């Protein structure tokens, strides 16, 4: 769609929309992030505070596989059950027949308690769990057991 551009509409107008006084020059302010402390400092301080300097401590050879730990909340905890058996599990809200959720094969590393699961007991297999999530599972009547 070169035909919908303003280059097509600027045909016949001298400056091509770039001005007669301050023309289109090559690099009137510098190239890239030039002068971010000198004449682009106002833009840096307004729109990107914290840009200059270093804060934290380094980590040589940091592998993100170590820190892989996707978080699953309790409101999404029941979506790990297939939709077919989900209704049966919700209706037959009994211990000693509780569904097993293995969040590790689901793809999650930690469980957080964002709240309001039903009162159906459930066996939750999680690598890590938060205090509130464990308390809410206990209140629902299920259990969270630690896996690896």
């Amino acid at each position: 769609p070169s035909r919908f551009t303003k280059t097509r509409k600027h045909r016949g107008h001298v400056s091509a929309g770039k001005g007669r006084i301050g023309k289109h020059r090559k690099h009137p302010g510098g190239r890239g992030m030039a002068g971010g402390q000198h004449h682009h400092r106002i833009n840096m301080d307004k729109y990107h505070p914290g840009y200059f300097g270093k804060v934290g401590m380094r980590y040589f050879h940091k592998q993100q596989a170590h820190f892989w730990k996707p978080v699953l909340n309790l409101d999404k905890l029941w979506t790990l059950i297939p939709e077919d058996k989900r209704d049966q599990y919700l209706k037959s809200a009994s211990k000693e027949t509780a569904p097993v959720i293995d969040t590790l094969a689901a793809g999650y590393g930690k469980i957080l308690g964002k709240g309001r699961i039903p009162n159906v007991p459930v066996i939750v297999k999680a690598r890590f769990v938060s205090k509130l999530a464990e308390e809410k599972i206990r209140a629902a009547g299920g259990v969270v057991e630690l896996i690896a």
Partner: protein, 185 residues
């Protein structure tokens, strides 16, 4: 010569005749232009405007939001009207027997409503069923919850989510964000 108090030839500033080329959306707009002209129900005018609205001004309405709206006292049996898309929400476990009229239903939300026992309705069926918007409840999704809007109005001492591609340490966490490096914002 006239000393003009206002700008001349100033357009409306509001959308009419939506940007969409959807023939069926144009048909709905035709039906509701007729209704809003010849009915004097404010519901028809509101629905016509919402039909003109654009995508970011028509955020999805979750079935959980619909359930919360039906939890209003005296609003259990009202027809829930969404000018937009109704999306599923798995954070809820039960859904009432309502009738929801909307432009679009996701498969999950459609199945959720039908299984709950109510009905999913298209806005023209709603127009046939309640030409003056009788016993309706219009819901609108969260508009200022977009990721784009959280960078709007960014400045010093505003707390408005810088426009950044990489997030973490040594990415805008330094001079200008803490008193240990100069000043704080």
């Amino acid at each position: 010569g006239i000393d003009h108090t206002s700008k001349q030839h100033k357009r409306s500033g509001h959308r009419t005749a939506p940007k969409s080329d959807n023939v069926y959306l144009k048909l709905l707009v035709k039906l509701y232009t007729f209704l809003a002209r010849r009915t004097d129900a404010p519901f028809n005018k509101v629905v016509l405007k919402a039909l003109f609205l654009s995508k970011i001004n028509r955020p999805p309405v979750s079935v959980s939001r619909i359930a919360r709206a039906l939890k209003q006292e005296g609003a259990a049996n009202k027809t829930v009207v969404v000018v937009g898309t109704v999306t599923d929400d798995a954070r809820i476990f039960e859904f009432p027997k309502t009738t929801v009229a909307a432009l679009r239903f996701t498969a999950g939300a459609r199945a959720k409503i039908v299984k709950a026992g109510g009905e999913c309705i298209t806005l023209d069926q709603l127009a046939v069923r309640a030409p003056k918007g009788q016993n309706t409840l219009i819901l609108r999704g969260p508009r200022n919850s977009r990721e784009a809007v959280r960078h709007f109005g960014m400045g010093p001492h505003k707390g408005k989510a810088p426009r950044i591609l990489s997030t973490g340490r040594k990415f805008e966490r330094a001079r200008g964000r803490r008193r240990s490096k100069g000043f704080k914002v």
